[PDB]
């Protein structure tokens, strides 16, 4: 139903934020990531008009831009088993996402969002609309585990390093 959908190669590059802004105190990693995904799937002119419109309508229903629309969709998606039409629409979105020519860049951007801003901190309890999207970008499903951060308390190196500035004001 979505054959021939061509996209701009670098449409979504201008949307991804800076790494320093990921650690902002008030930063919605979910909304920024969904905006990047929304930009990544914009139909171009080469796509025929009817399928273009149909995909635009589906994208508007599932991936809106207004905050109230996103909140309403998330709230109505908690009990998703009573909306089989949403299931079908999400599956259709997955099928076109999984064949995106820029899947690798999208997957690495998703991993960067997960590691820096903590896109998936619920580690398997993430929103349904995020679950299928991430499954499309990365099909292994390993994002349920987590970024696997690092630790320093295991003392792999006993340190005890005293450089020039630390050698002056040395205590004991």
């Amino acid at each position: 139903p979505f054959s021939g959908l061509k996209f701009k190669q670098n449409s979504f590059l201008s949307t991804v934020p800076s790494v320093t802004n990921m650690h902002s105190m008030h930063f919605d990693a979910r909304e920024t990531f969904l905006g990047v995904i929304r930009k990544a799937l914009e139909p171009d002119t080469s796509t025929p008009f009817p399928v273009r419109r149909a995909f635009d309508g589906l994208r508007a229903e599932i991936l809106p831009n207004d905050t109230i629309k996103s909140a309403a969709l998330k709230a109505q998606c908690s009990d998703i088993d009573k909306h089989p039409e949403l299931k079908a629409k999400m599956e259709t979105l997955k099928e076109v996402i999984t064949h995106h020519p820029q899947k690798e860049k999208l997957a690495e951007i998703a991993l960067q969002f997960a590691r820096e801003a903590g896109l998936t901190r619920l580690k398997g309890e993430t929103d349904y609309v995020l679950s299928n999207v991430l499954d499309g970008l990365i099909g292994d499903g390993s994002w349920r585990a987590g970024p696997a951060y690092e630790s320093y308390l295991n003392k792999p190196g006993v340190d005890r390093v005293i450089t020039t500035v630390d050698g002056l004001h040395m205590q004991r």
């Binding site: 800076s18 650690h23 902002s24 105190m25 930063f27 905006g35 002119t45």
Partner: protein, 371 residues
């Protein structure tokens, strides 16, 4: 009821109520997202600054231009800008006021189709119309014959109009405008140790170009004078207190309008483009089109550009013909004034596009009803 005119250009968004002499809201078409980390509670909670607040807080933002080279690219940013214009600057309800938008010639059809779809679906506008910018400019000039040179921040275009009959086969478009001049000035201020690489620095260099540059009558003669003495050099104060002085960059920056070879383009200068635009029309109207060079847009505001235009066209033109340049002082807003005129003429209210028509024909109606 009262009509709305919203001249969406690449550089500045000019909007206001129709039937008025001058615009009411002029704000740059810039959308800004914070760049650095936010560390203090309560400060932040603003994903995107758009309009003038995107110019106040330039230190911490990345400024993106939604409407590059005339064609809208980032449609979400354009939607934000339109929402801002309708709900904050004009303070009007979009569903209770007819609107009017502008577009350059030779644009992709998909652009205006998506424009109409956004206007009729997201905003639920009652009626709308898309007009080519230079015809509006001619409306503002109070004339019925002439050739118009509109040069803004994105696109420089020409259309020769004779007795209300435009000649589509003579329309010329050239993607060389204000933003290219600003970038060229950026590349040339490095020759004095001044470096500008970020978007806020882009706005600063654009301000320098607006406030100090001028068009030299004889580029070769002016270049000798600048290299001979220091009368041409001026001083500008950067926002952080440093003082810069620029010399031959004052008139080498706007020269790219006449010699697009400076930025590597193979196309010819604007004067020769205007000359060619006339030679593609019928022989009996060339006399009138020489005598009605109307020019509009911000990029046309440089001091002396009218005289250089006149001299170049006279050099190209036959000796008998009279070359006259019409440069009204308010030409920075000629397009908006023409939109205001056209939205208030009685014979225009039958050339609207209505939601009832939209539903029957779809987004394809715009090419059939508009030019």
């Amino acid at each position: 009821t009262t009509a709305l005119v919203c001249d969406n250009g690449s550089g500045l968004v000019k909007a206001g109520f129709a039937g008025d002499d001058a615009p009411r809201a002029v704000f740059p078409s810039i959308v800004g997202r914070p760049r650095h980390q936010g560390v203090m509670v309560g400060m932040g909670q603003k994903d995107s600054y758009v309009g003038d607040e995107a110019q106040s807080k330039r230190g911490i933002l990345t400024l993106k231009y939604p409407i590059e080279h005339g064609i809208i690219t980032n449609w979400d940013d354009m939607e934000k800008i339109w929402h801002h214009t309708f709900y904050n600057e004009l303070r009007v309800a979009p569903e209770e006021h007819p609107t009017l938008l502008t577009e350059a010639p030779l644009n992709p059809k998909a652009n205006r189709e998506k424009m109409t779809q956004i206007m009729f679906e997201t905003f639920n506008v009652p009626a709308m119309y898309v007009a080519i910018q230079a015809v509006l400019s001619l409306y503002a000039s109070g004339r019925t014959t002439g050739i118009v040179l509109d040069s803004g921040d994105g696109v420089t275009h020409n259309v020769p109009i004779y007795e209300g009959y435009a000649l589509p086969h003579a329309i010329m478009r050239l993607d060389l405008a204000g933003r290219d001049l600003t970038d060229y000035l950026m590349k040339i201020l490095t020759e004095r140790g001044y470096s500008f690489v970020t978007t806020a620095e882009r706005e600063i260099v654009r301000d320098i170009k607006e406030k100090l540059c001028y068009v030299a009558l004889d580029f070769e003669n002016e270049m000798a004078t600048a290299a001979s003495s220091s009368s041409l050099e001026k001083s500008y104060e950067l926002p952080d207190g440093q003082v810069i002085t620029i010399g031959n960059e004052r008139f080498r920056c706007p020269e790219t309008l006449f010699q697009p070879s400076f930025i590597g383009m193979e196309s010819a200068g604007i004067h020769e483009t205007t000359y060619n635009s006339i030679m593609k029309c019928d022989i009996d109207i060339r006399k009138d089109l020489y005598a009605n060079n109307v020019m509009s847009g911000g990029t046309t505001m440089y001091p002396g550009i009218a005289d250089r235009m006149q001299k170049e066209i006279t050099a190209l033109a036959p000796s008998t013909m009279k070359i006259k340049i019409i440069a009204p002082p308010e030409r920075k807003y000629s397009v908006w004034i023409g939109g205001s005129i056209l939205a208030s003429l009685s014979t225009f209210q039958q050339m609207w596009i209505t939601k009832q028509e939209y539903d029957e024909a779809g987004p394809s109606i715009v090419h059939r009803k508009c030019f």
